[PDB]
Design a protein around this ligand. Structure first.
Ligand code: CDL
Ligand code: CDL
Ligand code: HEA
Ligand code: HEA
Ligand code: 3PE
Ligand code: 9XX
Ligand code: 7PH
Ligand code: TRD
Ligand code: TRD
Ligand code: TRD
Ligand code: TRD
Ligand code: TRD
Ligand code: FES
Ligand code: CA
Ligand code: CU
Ligand code: CU
Ligand code: CU
Ligand code: MG
Lengths: 143, 139, 299, 66, 35, 184, 51, 55, 551
């Protein structure tokens, strides 16, 4: 079931390969936009002492139960604030753990949804994610 | 480690043959006779490979097969402590700065700078050699 | 065409030079053939063994072809054995010395000009004899216990002094005058560091050493004859300091009777330039001119 | 000449650089094209998280659409 | 530097040194814990 | 069950350091071939009444060094210290004896600037003497380290490789002494 | 041979006696004897602060 | 202040030593400030490493 | 199966991440990177020297340089390119990958390794500091012939600084050789037998043996030269036999030297060809034998540099020099056989290795021409020799060095260099090199000697000199895309999250992450051949590899 050229090693790690001249990562966004989003995540999380996360993919039919399922994959999920987006279903969800409750996220999470939605209507996915992370982390205190 | 010894013994055979051939061929029909610089260099290149090969050959016949000498050894044969490998040190750059001080002193022929550089070298080399052997301070 | 294959080698003006040029052309052709084969093999696999779009499995994983490995060590050995044989033949012919040269020249290199002395002339037909050695001046150099076999390093006795000498100057290129058709012997000594005696039309050069005998250098070489008259540049070919690029000389090859007239003029007290004008030659060097003594265009 | 010598030495390198950089740097690199919202999301699902702070009762959430 | 002392002397000295070092560390530690 | 890594590194380096003396031997033999029959030339009068005892002291320092190695391999730090102190004293005696020979040679007109023989004699024997001084520094540093912690196998390995260096220096001296004082 | 390179100061054009010139040995910076006279460069160097 | 002694002993032009001092008087303190700042923070990180992982 | 990742990997470490590491590190990976950076800075400095020389040689007459400055320029250009760029970058590459290739966590002596690097850096700085003296740097050539180098003929402090800087750096090189040999004989992983090691490791080991022969005798010769220059010694006195004493000693160093900076780079292309051919290396055992034969022979051919001195036994050295051509041709046949019937893709490492093959071939043919004393009697000390050794050097330490950099940059950094910019870099380098150096064969054959600051308009040399200078300035601009690529790719390059970005790597470094952890390996595979990473990543092929191995 392992991809071609991938091997399970004696430590349990996977030793994988790429064809020469091909890429390992291949996210459909420009490198400098990815760097901007990475900085938004890092410095928003540092300023709020809560781990901010972003999901892109299919959110199902309820799309909030699925988002709560995805939040379990963020490290220390009790202290995390996930923004999940379905470009197809055109759905925006924010879900956070219990550690963040009462720290300013009830005011800021809908503001993050609005910030994302405004940029999505222009067809700017990564710009919407960056703006939403910026507003939600600026509204959470390290409490 | 028989291959390690064999490599140096093969080099030794070639170097000894080259030294003998060169000395004999320059003694006969070469102006001035034996060419002493090249003959000396070839003889002592032979000596270099001979010293290392004899040491390896003596070591090989002592210890039985290591896991890196064994054609179908398992990775787990090599389990255990390897040895001590220094995690960090700023003494190497101090030793090189000291030796460079003495070298600049010798280049410009400043005997006081040469003396200072040699003293720096001895202090830096002591610092390196003692780094993992100084005990706790005593009070 | 022999000029394109010679790659800028001069045609040569001595028999030894012509033999060396033939060896050069043959060796160039051999190396070009080997290079064409190897380059073609590189271009072939680069052109026809590139990964296609319709190959899913890896190529055949061969890594050993023993008969081919053995066959590809014998052929280059054969080519270098042939080249070594002809190399030995030509160097034996080029380094050959006859016991009776017809002109013996003393070449003295110094930093950074040349001095040419006429040591001896013995024409093969008896039409010209001249004894030019001046041993009453080699003895004036004796410096004498001494650091080296009783001698100080200022001994200089190994240098040769002659009655007729052409001395180079920063404003006059030294012109060495030689007869055509005659066996010429060159004895090379340096006054200080190592220089290089290169006449490109000789297709040959040798290093000019201080104290060559103590260094086991053979400082003597001959050309069997120079096959045409004319003027030929010579350059220093061993890095000797500041003015290594600016100590050139010229060889003027004239007919033997004109050489005799030139030597009579020099024996009559004439300088090199006026003795050359006396035999209807240009008085100064014509392949090269003196370098401006200004250190450059910014001065 | 002397102006031709300086024209060649200065000019040939820059012309050659411009030509080779037009040949090679105008090609498309291996980086994927940027996803367009009007197109379907055919990539694998992506989960990004910040590594800070250095190291499951839900506390709430919000929803939205666009 | 050149000759060993009797082993009993070495043992007693080493034990005393270790006990003294431990007592000094403990004194500093308990003062720190108190304050 | 495995090679002593420090030992192999030391042996490899010592074999390289043989080439350094190869250069100096080449200088000596080149100057000797150009001697012209007088080697050593006047006024150099080598005396074996003093070179021989100094050579013998340096040779006996090898046996004392080997005794120290046997003590170290036995785990006996005090026997190692005693034998290495003796070896240090004997090598220091060699250095002083060489210096006295140098002083008496200089007064009679054999110097580095003075003659080609003086140049080769002094570079050869003086670089060997510098190697001896480096080995004495090595003894001092090793002996100080044995006072710093308990005597472990790594400490004994350090003693062994210092002895490898000392034996190299002694053998190089035997070669230099044979070629200078007997193959004149 | 160097007299054609001499530039005179205004008011001092006749202060030299032919090829003899006389300047104060006191440095105008801070008063040290500025007396390191380089004859080929014609440079007067002050040992104190390198004027 | 010792530029003339340094010029004599270490084969530097005296004029060059003056200009090295003049430019270095601005440049060397800036370089040293930057290096010392980064070096101090680097020692702080070296301490942190031992605190999380031991010796 | 959602694993949280970052949108982009961290561009740089925080403040204070690097500076204390640089001065305290015993990590061979960091030391190798430090070697590569510093050696490349020295390469740029030496290239600037060559650009000055080439600009002055474009026209007859001295336009901006004097004779003295030009002589310093070729002396120091040769010194910097040979001893401050190529020789230490051998140990830069060895530090980068050799412990990985044998499956070790470290080199045998980590602090000695750090000392070797710092000795390189400070010795090189001591030699280059001659340029800040009034007289200037050494101006007697990189070969430093006697008696031109004696206190009478080269009095300046530049020459003495050159001597002592070379001595300090040479000690660094010797200690590096000791370390590399000891690492290979002691730190191999279980099952990594001597005849399963990669060819690069074999070549590093044999090169280290060569280092232990050549550099100590050069150190002895330099100390004799310093004794003459400072103490009035007579070592290199002409009446004492000193001219050829110097030449014999120097070339006994100087020939081994040129193969110290050839065999490691042969090993680099031996690593690269099988990956991009999707094939094994052809004749693995024969390649090892060829390396050993070349190393043995390179110690017995030195006087082919002395043909025109009239004082060496010509047939001995001529025959030995011809013999060296046989194992090198074996290497050329082994490399073409590795490519033969593969699936070639020509990414930047492969492209630079092919540039190696093409350029080195002409260099070696020219060298064989030089090996016969009669032809060397005309072409020695001329620009034919210059063309030869730039064809043969630039092939190993530029094309194979760049091949190693493009190959192993993802392994050492976790980022890929941009391949479009790499192709621009290759084609500028390849076109520029042949433009500057092919016409120098003709110039030397006509009669233009090496090491001339000036010539006359009537010499017939001007047009080819102009062409060579045009090519040299192409080589100058070829450096800009590479430096830009590394600067951009080091922080913003394509992330590498696999172990083998080139797909078909064979050596153990491709069986670990990009970059490796501090001690290089979180696990090791079973080692049963010289392609352990290939067998790890393609188990289904192992049977085929055993079946198809013999034609
Ligand atoms: C005289 C010398 C004495 C001191 C002078 C100044 C020393 C300053 C050193 C310092 O502050 O530390 C570095 C310092 C970093 O300090 P830090 O606080 O550790 O910051 C951590 C960083 O986040 C960086 O974090 P990181 O560790 O993630 O960075 C990764 C990467 C960063 O990568 C990059 O940003 C790209 C690097 C440039 C590209 C290279 C060009 C292409 C060359 C080919 C390379 C082939 C491979 O850097 C490296 O990995 C470099 C490692 C090896 C560097 C060479 C070390 C030389 C040692 C000898 C001297 C000591 O660098 C800077 O921030 C400024 C750069 C300093 C100027 C460069 C030097 C001048 C140019 C040469 C001299 C010219 C005149 C002659
Ligand atoms: C010359 C360089 C000679 C070094 C060659 C030895 C390579 C073996 C590798 C090794 O074991 O490395 C240990 C270690 C490297 O540290 P590591 O990488 O952490 O290795 C740890 C080992 O695994 C664990 O080993 P360990 O911690 O037990 O230490 C082993 C060490 C323990 O040996 C000792 O007891 C200390 C000896 C220190 C060397 C004394 C230097 C003498 C300088 C005097 C200058 C005045 C003249 O044994 C040796 O290194 C055996 C060599 C015997 C020394 C004889 C050399 C005479 C000097 C010749 C002067 C000419 O290096 C040293 O301890 C000494 C190397 C210092 C290099 C000197 C550079 C400047 C010299 C310039 C002299 C001219 C001035 C004018
Ligand atoms: C070993 C490697 C090596 C390398 C890579 C080179 C590289 C080059 N070399 Fe060579 N060279 C030698 C080794 C090497 N060299 C040796 C041993 C000698 C003999 C020395 C002696 O005579 O004693 C020699 C001598 C030599 C001569 C003969 C000089 C003479 O006899 O008079 C010439 C002639 O043109 C030449 C040219 C070049 C050129 C144009 C490059 C091109 O690679 C260089 C162009 C490259 C650049 C890199 C330009 C710099 C680019 C920049 C962008 C710099 C800008 C910024 C800064 C500098 C901070 N060099
Ligand atoms: C990387 C560096 C390097 C390498 C690999 C070489 C390799 C060789 N070199 Fe050279 N050389 C230098 C660097 C190098 N050299 C330098 C720097 C100088 C000048 C020093 C100075 O004076 O400044 C110099 C000078 C030099 C001289 C002295 C010339 C002179 O000054 O007068 C000679 C002469 O014998 C020589 C010859 C050779 C030969 C025969 C090889 C051989 O090893 C090459 C063998 C390769 C081939 C032959 C090609 C492959 C073979 C085949 C495909 C099979 C074909 C079969 C046949 C032809 C039979 N070179
Ligand atoms: C290292 C420094 C070495 C110092 C060398 C030195 O100064 O010795 C030279 C000196 C000879 O000087 P000289 O002109 O002959 O007059 C002497 C009158 N008493 O006296 C000598 O000849 C000294 C003899 C050499 C001393 C040993 C030096 C070792 C060489 C290693 C370099
Ligand atoms: C920055 C120092 C170097 C700057 C000066 C050179 C900066 C380098 C770039 C311009 C110099 C060469 C381009 C112009 C060429 C020319 O036409 O000649 C100009 C001058 C008329 O001739 C010279 O000879 C210049 C000096 C030579 C350089 C000595 C090398 C010094 C050693 C340093 C490498 C030590 C580390 C650096 C030390 C870094 C700082 C120390 C804390
Ligand atoms: C040079 C003195 C000569 C003495 C004659 C006998 C030689 C052996 C002496 C043994 C010394 C023991 C020191 C010791 O254990 O104390 C150690 C402390 O000394 C040192 O760490 C530095 C020693 C001096 C370094 C040498 C520098 C120059 C070398 C001179 C080269 C000739 C033990 O300290 P500790 O007990 O751990 O507190
Ligand atoms: C005809 C005499 C020649 C004898 C050969 C000399 C061999 C060189 C010996 C080297 C010395 C090392 C100490
Ligand atoms: C005046 C005629 C010149 C002919 C030049 C010959 C071309 C040489 C071939 C170049 C080598 C290709 C690799
Ligand atoms: C010219 C006569 C030959 C002299 C022989 C010199 C050989 C010296 C070797 C010494 C080696 C001693 C161990
Ligand atoms: C093995 C040597 C190859 C040399 C080829 C040189 C070709 C140079 C072409 C220039 C033509 C100028 C007239
Ligand atoms: C990639 C091409 C590099 C080779 C350039 C060859 C230049 C030869 C021109 C000869 C000019 C005739 C005088
Ligand atoms: S007193 Fe003259 S410069 Fe200061
Ligand atoms: Ca010019
Ligand atoms: Cu000359
Ligand atoms: Cu010259
Ligand atoms: Cu060579
Ligand atoms: Mg020559």
């Amino acid at each position: 079931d392992l991809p071609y050229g991938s091997a399970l090693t004696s430590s349990g790690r996977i030793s994988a390969v790429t064809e020469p001249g091909e890429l390992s990562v291949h996210y459909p966004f420009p490198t400098m936009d990815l760097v901007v989003l990475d900085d938004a995540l890092k410095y928003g999380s540092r300023a709020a002492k809560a781990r901010f996360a972003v999901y892109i993919g299919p959110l199902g039919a309820d799309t909030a139960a699925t988002a709560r399922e995805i939040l379990a994959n963020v490290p220390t999920p009790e202290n995390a604030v996930l923004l999940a987006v379905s470009p197809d279903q055109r759905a925006i969800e924010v879900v956070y753990g219990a550690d963040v409750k009462g720290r300013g996220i009830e005011s800021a999470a809908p503001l993050g949804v609005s910030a994302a939605a405004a940029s999505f209507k222009e067809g700017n996915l990564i710009d919407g994610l960056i703006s939403a992370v910026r507003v939600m982390s600026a509204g959470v205190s390290p409490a | 480690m028989h291959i390690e010894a064999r490599l140096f013994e093969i080099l030794t055979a070639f170097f000894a043959l080259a030294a003998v051939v060169y000395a004999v061929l320059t003694a006969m029909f070469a102006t001035g006779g034996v060419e002493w610089a090249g003959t000396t260099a070839l003889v002592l290149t032979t000596g270099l490979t001979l010293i290392t090969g004899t040491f390896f050959r003596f070591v090989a016949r002592r210890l039985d097969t290591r896991p890196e000498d064994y054609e179908d050894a398992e990775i787990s044969d090599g389990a255990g402590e390897l040895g001590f490998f220094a995690p960090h040190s700023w003494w190497p750059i101090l030793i090189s700065l000291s030796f460079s001080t003495a070298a600049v002193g010798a280049a410009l022929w400043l005997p006081w700078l040469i003396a200072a550089g040699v003293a720096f070298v001895i202090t830096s080399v002591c610092g390196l050699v003692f780094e993992y052997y100084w005990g706790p301070e005593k009070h | 065409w022999s000029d394109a294959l010679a790659l800028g080698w001069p045609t040569g003006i001595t028999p030894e030079a012509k033999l060396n040029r033939e060896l050069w052309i043959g060796s160039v052709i051999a190396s070009f053939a080997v290079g064409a084969i190897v380059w073609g093999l590189i271009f072939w696999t680069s052109a026809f063994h590139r990964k296609k779009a319709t190959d899913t499995e890896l190529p055949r994983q061969f890594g050993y072809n023993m008969p081919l490995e053995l066959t590809l060590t014998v052929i280059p050995f054969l080519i270098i054995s042939v080249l070594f044989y002809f190399t030995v033949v030509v160097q034996e012919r080029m380094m050959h010395k006859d016991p009776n040269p017809e002109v013996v020249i003393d070449v003295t290199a110094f930093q950074w000009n040349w001095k040419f002395g006429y040591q001896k002339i013995a024409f093969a037909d008896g039409s010209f004899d001249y004894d030019g050695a001046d041993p009453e001046r080699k003895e004036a150099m004796t410096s004498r216990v001494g650091p080296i076999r009783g001698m100080t390093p200022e001994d200089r006795t190994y240098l040769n002094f002659d009655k007729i000498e052409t001395l180079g100057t920063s404003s006059e290129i030294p012109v060495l005058v030689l007869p055509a058709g005659k066996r010429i012997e060159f004895v090379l000594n340096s006054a200080d560091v190592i220089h290089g005696f290169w006449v490109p039309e000789f297709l040959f050069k040798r290093d000019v050493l201080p104290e060559p005998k103590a260094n086991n250098s053979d400082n003597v070489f001959q050309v069997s004859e120079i096959q045409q008259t004319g003027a030929f540049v010579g350059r220093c070919t061993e890095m000797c300091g500041t003015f290594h690029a600016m100590m050139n000389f010229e060889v003027r090859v004239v007919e033997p009777n004109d050489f005799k007239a030139y030597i009579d003029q020099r024996n009559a007290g004439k300088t090199n330039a006026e003795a050359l004008a006396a035999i209807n030659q240009p008085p100064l060097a014509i392949t090269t001119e003196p370098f401006e003594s200004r250190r450059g265009e910014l001065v | 000449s002397t102006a031709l010598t300086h024209g060649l030495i200065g000019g040939v390198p820059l012309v050659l650089f411009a030509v080779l950089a037009l040949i090679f740097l105008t090609r498309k690199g291996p980086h994927p094209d940027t996803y367009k919202m009007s197109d379907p999301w055919t990539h694998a699902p992506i989960l990004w998280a910040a590594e800070e702070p250095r190291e499951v009762v839900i506390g709430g959430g919000a929803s939205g659409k666009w | 530097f050149l000759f060993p002392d009797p082993a009993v002397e070495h043992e007693a000295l080493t034990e005393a040194a270790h006990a003294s070092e431990h007592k000094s560390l403990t004194a500093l530690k308990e003062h720190q814990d108190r304050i | 069950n495995r090679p002593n890594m420090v030992s192999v590194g030391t042996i490899v380096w010592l074999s390289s350091e043989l080439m350094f003396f190869a250069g100096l031997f080449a200088m000596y033999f080149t100057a000797r071939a150009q001697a012209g029959g007088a080697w050593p030339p006047e006024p150099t009068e080598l005396n074996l009444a003093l070179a021989v005892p100094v050579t013998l002291v340096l040779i006996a320092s090898s046996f004392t060094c080997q005794m120290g190695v046997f003590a170290a391999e036995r785990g006996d730090v005090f026997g190692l210290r005693r034998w290495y102190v003796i070896t240090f004293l004997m090598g220091l005696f060699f250095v002083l004896g060489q210096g006295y020979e140098y002083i008496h040679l200089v007064e009679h007109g054999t110097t580095i600037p003075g003659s080609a023989y003086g140049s080769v004699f002094y570079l050869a024997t003086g670089f060997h003497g510098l190697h001896v001084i480096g080995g004495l520094v090595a003894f001092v540093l090793l002996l100080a380290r044995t006072k710093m912690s308990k005597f472990t196998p790594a400490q004994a390995t350090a003693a062994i490789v210092v002895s490898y260096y000392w034996h190299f220096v002694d053998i190089v001296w035997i070669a230099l002494f044979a070629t200078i004082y007997f193959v004149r | 041979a160097d007299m054609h390179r001499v530039i005179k100061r205004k008011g001092q054009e006749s202060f030299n006696f032919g090829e003899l010139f006389a300047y104060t040995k006191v440095c105008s910076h801070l008063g040290c004897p500025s007396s390191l006279y380089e004859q080929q460069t014609y440079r007067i160097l002050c040992p104190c602060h390198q004027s | 202040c010792m530029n003339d002694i340094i010029a004599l002993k270490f084969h530097i032009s005296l004029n060059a030593t003056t200009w090295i001092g003049r430019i270095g008087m601005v440049v060397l303190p800036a370089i040293v400030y930057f290096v010392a700042y980064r070096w101090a923070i680097s020692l702080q990180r070296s301490d942190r490493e031992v605190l999380e992982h031991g010796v | 199966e959602l694993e949280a990742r970052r949108p982009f990997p961290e561009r740089m470490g925080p403040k204070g991440n690097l500076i204390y590491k640089l001065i305290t590190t015993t990590d061979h990976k960091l030391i190798g990177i430090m070697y590569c950076v510093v050696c490349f800075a020295f390469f740029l400095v030496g290239g600037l020297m060559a650009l000055f020389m080439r600009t002055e040689l474009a026209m007859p007459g001295l336009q901006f340089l004097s004779n003295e400055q030009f002589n310093q320029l070729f002396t120091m250009h040769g010194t910097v390119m040979l001893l401050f760029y190529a020789t230490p970058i051998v140990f830069g590459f060895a530090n980068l990958v050799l412990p990985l290739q044998i499956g070790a966590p470290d080199v045998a002596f980590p602090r000695l390794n750090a000392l070797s690097f710092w000795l390189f850096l400070f010795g090189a700085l001591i030699a280059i500091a001659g340029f800040i003296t009034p007289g200037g740097a050494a101006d007697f050539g990189w070969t430093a012939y006697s008696p031109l180098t004696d206190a009478i003929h080269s009095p300046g402090a530049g020459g003495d600084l050159w001597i002592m800087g070379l001595a300090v750096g040479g000690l660094g090189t010797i200690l590096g050789g000791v370390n590399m040999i000891t690492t290979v004989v002691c730190m191999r992983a279980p099952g990594m037998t001597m005849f399963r090691m990669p060819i690069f490791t074999w070549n590093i080991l044999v090169t280290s043996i060569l280092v232990l022969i050549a550099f100590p005798i050069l150190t002895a010769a330099l100390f004799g030269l310093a004794a003459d220059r400072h103490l009035g010694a007579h070592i290199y006195d002409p009446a004492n036999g000193g001219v050829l004493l110097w030449q014999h000693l120097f070339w006994f160093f100087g020939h081994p030297e040129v193969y110290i900076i050839a065999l490691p780079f042969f090993g680099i292309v031996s690593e690269i060809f099988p990956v991009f051919s999707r094939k094994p290396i052809f004749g693995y055992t024969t390649l090892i034998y060829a390396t050993l034969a070349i190393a043995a022979l390179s110690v017995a051919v030195w006087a082919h540099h002395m043909y025109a001195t009239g004082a060496v036994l010509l047939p001995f050295f001529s025959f030995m020099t011809f013999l060296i051509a046989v194992p090198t041709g074996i290497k050329f046949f082994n490399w073409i056989g590795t490519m033969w019937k593969g699936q070639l893709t020509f990414e930047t490492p492969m492209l630079f290795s092919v540039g190696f093959l093409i350029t080195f071939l002409l260099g070696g043919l020219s060298g064989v021409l030089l090996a016969s004393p009669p032809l060397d009697f005309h072409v020695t000390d001329s620009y034919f020799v210059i063309a030869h050794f730039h064809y043969v050097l630039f092939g190993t330490i530029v094309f194979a060095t760049y091949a190693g950099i493009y190959f192993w940059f993802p392994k050492m950094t976790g980022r890929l260099l941009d391949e479009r910019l790499g192709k621009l870099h290759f084609w500028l380098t390849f076109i520029g090199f042949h433009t500057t150096f092919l016409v120098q064969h003709w110039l030397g054959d006509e009669g233009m000697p090496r090491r001339y600051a000036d010539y006359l308009p009537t010499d017939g040399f001007t047009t080819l000199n102009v062409i060579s200078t045009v090519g040299a300035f192409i080589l100058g601009v070829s450096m800009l895309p590479f430096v830009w690529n590394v600067f951009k790719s080091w922080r913003y390059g394509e992330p590498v999250t696999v172990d083998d970005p080139w797909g078909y790597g064979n050596s153990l470094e491709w069986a670990t992450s990009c970059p490796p952890p501090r001690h290089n390996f979180t696990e090791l595979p079973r080692i049963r051949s010289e392609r352990p990473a290939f067998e790890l990543h393609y188990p289904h092929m192992v049977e085929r590899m055993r079946a198809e191995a013999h034609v």
